[PDB]
Coordinates of C-alpha atoms in Angstrom, one line a residue:
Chain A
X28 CA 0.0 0.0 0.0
X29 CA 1.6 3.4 -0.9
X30 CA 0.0 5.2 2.1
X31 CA 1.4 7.9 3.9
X32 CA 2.0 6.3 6.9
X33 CA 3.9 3.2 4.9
X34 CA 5.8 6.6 3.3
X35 CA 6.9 8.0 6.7
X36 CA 8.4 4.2 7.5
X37 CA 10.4 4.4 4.4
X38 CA 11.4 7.6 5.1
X39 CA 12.2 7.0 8.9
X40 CA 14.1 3.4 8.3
X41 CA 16.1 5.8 5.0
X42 CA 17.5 7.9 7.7
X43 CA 18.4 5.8 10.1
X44 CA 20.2 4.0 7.8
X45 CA 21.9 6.2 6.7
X46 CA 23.3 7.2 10.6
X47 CA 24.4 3.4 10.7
X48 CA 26.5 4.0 7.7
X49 CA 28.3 6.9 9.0
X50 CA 28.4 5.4 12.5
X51 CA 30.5 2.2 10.6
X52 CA 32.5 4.4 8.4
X53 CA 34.1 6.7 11.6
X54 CA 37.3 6.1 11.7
X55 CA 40.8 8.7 13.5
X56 CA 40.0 12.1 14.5
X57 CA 36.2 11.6 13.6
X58 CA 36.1 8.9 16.6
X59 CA 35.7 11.7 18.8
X60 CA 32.5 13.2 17.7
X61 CA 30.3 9.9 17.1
X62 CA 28.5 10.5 20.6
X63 CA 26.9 13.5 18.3
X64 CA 24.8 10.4 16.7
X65 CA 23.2 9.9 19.8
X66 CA 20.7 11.6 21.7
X67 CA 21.1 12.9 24.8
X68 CA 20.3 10.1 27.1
X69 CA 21.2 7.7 24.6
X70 CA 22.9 4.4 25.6
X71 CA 26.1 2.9 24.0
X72 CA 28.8 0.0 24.7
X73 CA 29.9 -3.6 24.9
X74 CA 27.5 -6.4 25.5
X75 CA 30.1 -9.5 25.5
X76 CA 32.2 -8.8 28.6
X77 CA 34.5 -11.5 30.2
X78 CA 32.2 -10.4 33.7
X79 CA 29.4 -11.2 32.1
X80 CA 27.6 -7.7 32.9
X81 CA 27.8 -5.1 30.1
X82 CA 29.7 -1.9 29.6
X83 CA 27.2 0.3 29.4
X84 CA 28.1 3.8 28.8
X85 CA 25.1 6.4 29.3
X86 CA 24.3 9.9 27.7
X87 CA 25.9 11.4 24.9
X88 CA 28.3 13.7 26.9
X89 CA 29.9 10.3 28.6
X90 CA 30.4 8.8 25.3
X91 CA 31.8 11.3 23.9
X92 CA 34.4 11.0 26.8
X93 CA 34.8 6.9 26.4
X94 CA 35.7 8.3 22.6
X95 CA 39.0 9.6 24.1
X96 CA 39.7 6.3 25.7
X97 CA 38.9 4.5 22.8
X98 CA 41.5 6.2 20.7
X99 CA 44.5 5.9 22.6
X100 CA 43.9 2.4 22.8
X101 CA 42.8 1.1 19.3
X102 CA 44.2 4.1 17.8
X103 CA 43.7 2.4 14.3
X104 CA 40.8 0.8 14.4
X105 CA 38.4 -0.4 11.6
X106 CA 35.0 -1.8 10.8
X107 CA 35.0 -4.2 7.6
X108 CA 32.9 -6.4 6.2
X109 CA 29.8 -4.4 6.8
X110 CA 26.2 -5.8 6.2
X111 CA 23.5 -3.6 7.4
X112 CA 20.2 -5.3 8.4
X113 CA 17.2 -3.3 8.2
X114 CA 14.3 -4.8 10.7
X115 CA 10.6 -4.9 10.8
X116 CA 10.9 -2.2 13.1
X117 CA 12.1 1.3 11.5
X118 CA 13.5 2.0 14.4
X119 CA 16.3 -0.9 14.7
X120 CA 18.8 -2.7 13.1
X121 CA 21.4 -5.0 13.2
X122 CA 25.1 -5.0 11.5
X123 CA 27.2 -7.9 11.3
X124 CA 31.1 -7.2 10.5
X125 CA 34.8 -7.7 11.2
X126 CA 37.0 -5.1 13.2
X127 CA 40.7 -5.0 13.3
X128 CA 43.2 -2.9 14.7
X129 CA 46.7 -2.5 17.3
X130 CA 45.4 -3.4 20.8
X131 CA 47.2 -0.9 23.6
X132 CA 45.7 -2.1 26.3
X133 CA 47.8 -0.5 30.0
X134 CA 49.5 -4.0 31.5
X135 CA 49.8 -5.8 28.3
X136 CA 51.9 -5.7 25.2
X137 CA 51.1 -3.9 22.2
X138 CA 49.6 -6.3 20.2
X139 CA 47.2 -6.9 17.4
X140 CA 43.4 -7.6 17.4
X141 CA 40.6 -8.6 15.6
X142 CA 37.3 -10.2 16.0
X143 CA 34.0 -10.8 14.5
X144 CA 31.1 -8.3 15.6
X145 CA 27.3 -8.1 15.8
X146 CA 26.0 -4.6 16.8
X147 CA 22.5 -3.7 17.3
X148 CA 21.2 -0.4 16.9
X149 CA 18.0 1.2 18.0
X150 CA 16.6 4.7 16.9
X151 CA 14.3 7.8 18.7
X152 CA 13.2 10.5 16.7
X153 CA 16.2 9.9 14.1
X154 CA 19.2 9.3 16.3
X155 CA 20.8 6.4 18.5
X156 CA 19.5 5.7 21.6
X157 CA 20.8 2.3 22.1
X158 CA 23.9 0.6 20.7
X159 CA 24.8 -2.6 21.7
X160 CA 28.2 -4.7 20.3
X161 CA 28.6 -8.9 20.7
X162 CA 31.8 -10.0 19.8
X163 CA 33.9 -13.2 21.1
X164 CA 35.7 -11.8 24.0
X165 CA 38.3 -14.8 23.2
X166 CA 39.9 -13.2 20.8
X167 CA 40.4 -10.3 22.8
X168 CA 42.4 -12.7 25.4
X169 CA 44.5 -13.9 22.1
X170 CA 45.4 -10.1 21.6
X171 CA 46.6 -9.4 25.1
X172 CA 48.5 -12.3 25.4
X173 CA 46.4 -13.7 27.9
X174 CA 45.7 -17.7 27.7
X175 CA 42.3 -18.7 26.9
X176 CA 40.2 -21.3 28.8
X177 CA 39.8 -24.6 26.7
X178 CA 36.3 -26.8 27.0
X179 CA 36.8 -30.4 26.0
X180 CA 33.6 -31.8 24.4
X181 CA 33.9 -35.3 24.7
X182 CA 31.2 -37.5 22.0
X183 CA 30.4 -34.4 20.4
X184 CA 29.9 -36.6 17.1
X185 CA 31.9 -36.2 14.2
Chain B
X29 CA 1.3 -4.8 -5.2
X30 CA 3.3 -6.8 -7.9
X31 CA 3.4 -11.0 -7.6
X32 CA 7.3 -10.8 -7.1
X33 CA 6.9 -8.9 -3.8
X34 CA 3.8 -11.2 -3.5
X35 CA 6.4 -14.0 -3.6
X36 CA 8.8 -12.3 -1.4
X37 CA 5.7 -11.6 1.1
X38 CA 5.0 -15.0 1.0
X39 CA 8.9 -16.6 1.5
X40 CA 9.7 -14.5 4.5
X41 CA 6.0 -15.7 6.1
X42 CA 6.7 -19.3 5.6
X43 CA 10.3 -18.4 6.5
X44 CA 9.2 -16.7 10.0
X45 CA 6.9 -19.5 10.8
X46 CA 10.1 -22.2 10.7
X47 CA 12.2 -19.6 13.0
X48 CA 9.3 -20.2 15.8
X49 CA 8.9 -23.8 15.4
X50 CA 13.2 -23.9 15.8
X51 CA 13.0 -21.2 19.0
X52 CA 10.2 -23.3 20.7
X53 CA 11.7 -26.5 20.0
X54 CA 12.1 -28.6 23.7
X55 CA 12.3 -31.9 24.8
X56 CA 12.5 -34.9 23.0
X57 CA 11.3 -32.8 20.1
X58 CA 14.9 -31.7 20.0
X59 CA 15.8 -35.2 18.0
X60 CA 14.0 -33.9 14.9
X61 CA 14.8 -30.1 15.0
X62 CA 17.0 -31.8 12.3
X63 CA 14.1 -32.1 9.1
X64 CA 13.5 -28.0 9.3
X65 CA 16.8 -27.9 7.3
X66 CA 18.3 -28.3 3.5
X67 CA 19.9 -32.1 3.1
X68 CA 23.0 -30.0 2.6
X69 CA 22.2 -27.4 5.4
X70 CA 24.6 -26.1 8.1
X71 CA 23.9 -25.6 12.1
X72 CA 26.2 -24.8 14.7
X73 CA 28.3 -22.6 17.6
X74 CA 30.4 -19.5 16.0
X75 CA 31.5 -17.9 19.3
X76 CA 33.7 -20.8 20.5
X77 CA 37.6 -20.7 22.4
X78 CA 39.2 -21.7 19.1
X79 CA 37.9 -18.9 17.3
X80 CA 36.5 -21.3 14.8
X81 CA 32.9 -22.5 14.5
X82 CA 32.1 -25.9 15.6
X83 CA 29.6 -26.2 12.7
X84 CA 28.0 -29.1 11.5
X85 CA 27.2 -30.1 8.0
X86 CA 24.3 -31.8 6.5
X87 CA 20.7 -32.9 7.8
X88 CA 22.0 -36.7 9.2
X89 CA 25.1 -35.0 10.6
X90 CA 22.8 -32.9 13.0
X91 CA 20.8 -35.5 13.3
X92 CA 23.4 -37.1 15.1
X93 CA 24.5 -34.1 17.1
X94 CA 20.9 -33.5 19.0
X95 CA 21.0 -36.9 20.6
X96 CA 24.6 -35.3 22.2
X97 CA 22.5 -32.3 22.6
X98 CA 19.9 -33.8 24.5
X99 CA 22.5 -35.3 26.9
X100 CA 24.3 -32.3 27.3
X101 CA 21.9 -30.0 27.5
X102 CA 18.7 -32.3 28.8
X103 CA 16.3 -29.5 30.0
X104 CA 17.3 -26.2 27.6
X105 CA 14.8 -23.6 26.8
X106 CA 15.2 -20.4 24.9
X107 CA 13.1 -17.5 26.3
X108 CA 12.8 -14.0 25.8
X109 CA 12.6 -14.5 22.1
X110 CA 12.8 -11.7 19.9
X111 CA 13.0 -12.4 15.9
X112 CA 13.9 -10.0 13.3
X113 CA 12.5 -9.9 9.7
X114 CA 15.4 -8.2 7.0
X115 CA 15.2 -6.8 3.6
X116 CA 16.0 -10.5 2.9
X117 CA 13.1 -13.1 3.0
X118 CA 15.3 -15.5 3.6
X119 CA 17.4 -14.0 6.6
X120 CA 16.4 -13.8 9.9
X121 CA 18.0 -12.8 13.2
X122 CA 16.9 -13.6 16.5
X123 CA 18.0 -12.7 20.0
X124 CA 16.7 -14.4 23.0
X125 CA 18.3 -15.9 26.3
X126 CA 18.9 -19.4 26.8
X127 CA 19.3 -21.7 29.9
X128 CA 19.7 -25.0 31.3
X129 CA 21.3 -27.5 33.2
X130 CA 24.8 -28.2 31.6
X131 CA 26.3 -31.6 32.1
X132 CA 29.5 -32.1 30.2
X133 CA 32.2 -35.2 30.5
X134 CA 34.5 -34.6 32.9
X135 CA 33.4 -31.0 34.3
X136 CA 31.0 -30.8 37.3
X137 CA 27.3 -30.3 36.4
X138 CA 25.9 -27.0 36.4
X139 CA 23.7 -24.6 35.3
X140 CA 24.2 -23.0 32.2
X141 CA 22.7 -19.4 31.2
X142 CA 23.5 -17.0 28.5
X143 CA 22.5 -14.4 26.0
X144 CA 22.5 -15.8 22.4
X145 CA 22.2 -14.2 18.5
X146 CA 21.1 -16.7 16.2
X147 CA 21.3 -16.1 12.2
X148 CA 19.0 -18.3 10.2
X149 CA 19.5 -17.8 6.3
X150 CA 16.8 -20.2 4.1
X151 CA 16.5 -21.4 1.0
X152 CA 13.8 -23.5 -0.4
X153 CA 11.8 -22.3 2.6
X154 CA 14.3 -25.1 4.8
X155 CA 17.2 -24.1 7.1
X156 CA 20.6 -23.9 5.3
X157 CA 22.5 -21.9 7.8
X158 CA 21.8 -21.5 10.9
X159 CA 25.1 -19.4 13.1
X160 CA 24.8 -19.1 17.0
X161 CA 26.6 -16.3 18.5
X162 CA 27.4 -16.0 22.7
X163 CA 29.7 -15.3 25.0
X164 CA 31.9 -18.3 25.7
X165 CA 33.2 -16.7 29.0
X166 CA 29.5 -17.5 30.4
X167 CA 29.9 -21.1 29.5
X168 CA 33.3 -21.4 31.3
X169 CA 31.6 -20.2 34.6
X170 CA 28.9 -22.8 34.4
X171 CA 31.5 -25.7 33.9
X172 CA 33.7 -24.5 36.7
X173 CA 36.4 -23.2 34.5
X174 CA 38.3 -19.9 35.1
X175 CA 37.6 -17.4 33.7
X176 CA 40.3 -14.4 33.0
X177 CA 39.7 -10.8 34.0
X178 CA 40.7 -8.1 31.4
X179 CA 41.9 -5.1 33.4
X180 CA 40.8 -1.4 31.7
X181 CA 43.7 1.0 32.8
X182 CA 42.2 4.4 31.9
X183 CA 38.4 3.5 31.4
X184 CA 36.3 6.4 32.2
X185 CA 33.4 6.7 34.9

């Protein structure tokens, strides 16, 4: 049906869209003003902790100072691989990608990570107000030199 | 209102309806989760400590693998179930929690929870790839295995 409302859908999930774009393509110096994506209470951070609680970093103002920390310690970082998925819901969508970059990480060598990411990302009136990113904390461990746990699985069948 | 996007309409329906029979899956039911996928279709763990899937190839081969399942996993449910329609009929993702009593060879029982995101990509209207995504760390704890801490030096508050 090309109804209005179906219009203002389209139109709502074609900017958003296009905020996830920019949001993947920050990279250096830009790194610093990505909080500006958000709105003011909006809610940004890692998901896949080895503590098994989030990192949860809220209101724009404290992201934009977790953008400092972020820089001095993957100072190279970037997204690849990108696939955006739009949802049913205008207001959310999913990205599935790789991310590499130097790890400098206080107490650990310099060293060099990368991982596999999902990130989820909800809208309010046309900007983030809740990003969330999975990764394999694992691989993190592999990058700071840290040993990772093994799990035997015994008759698994192969 | 053309008959392609009729068609598309139509996949992803079909499509959504073998995503809920897979999340509500339980029980001895588990043995036959199997026949919702391609004879050449692909199911398994892509967050793992090798950093490489354990996948599992082929509609006998996970067969197989859910009567190991069952007896590692012997009362798991999924709840909290929230799926996700794409621009692609045939790809789906869902997040949801999962939880159960875990009872591996040689580790002490326990009880296993964790937050998962599944990817289900379909063809013919059957499963060929289905990609689980968690936190392994989460798994360690329930089997009794350390986990290490990461420390974050300068990490603002």
């Amino acid at each position: 049906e090309n109804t209005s409302e179906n219009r203002a859908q389209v139109a709502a999930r074609q900017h958003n869209r296009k905020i996830v774009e920019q949001y993947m393509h920050t990279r250096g110096e830009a790194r610093l003003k990505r909080h500006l994506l958000f709105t003011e209470d909006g809610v940004g951070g890692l998901w896949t902790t080895d503590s098994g609680q989030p990192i949860a970093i809220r209101g724009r103002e404290k992201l934009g100072e977790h953008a400092v920390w972020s820089l001095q310690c993957f100072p190279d970082w970037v997204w690849t691989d990108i696939q955006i998925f739009e949802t049913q819901d205008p207001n959310w969508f999913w990205v599935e990608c790789r991310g590499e970059g130097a790890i400098v990480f206080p107490g650990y060598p310099r060293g060099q990570y990368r991982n596999h990411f999902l990130h989820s990302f909800r809208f309010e009136n046309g900007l983030i107000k809740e990003q969330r990113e999975f990764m394999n904390p694992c691989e993190q461990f592999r990058s700071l030199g840290i040993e990772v746990p093994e799990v035997r699985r015994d008759g698994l069948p192969s």
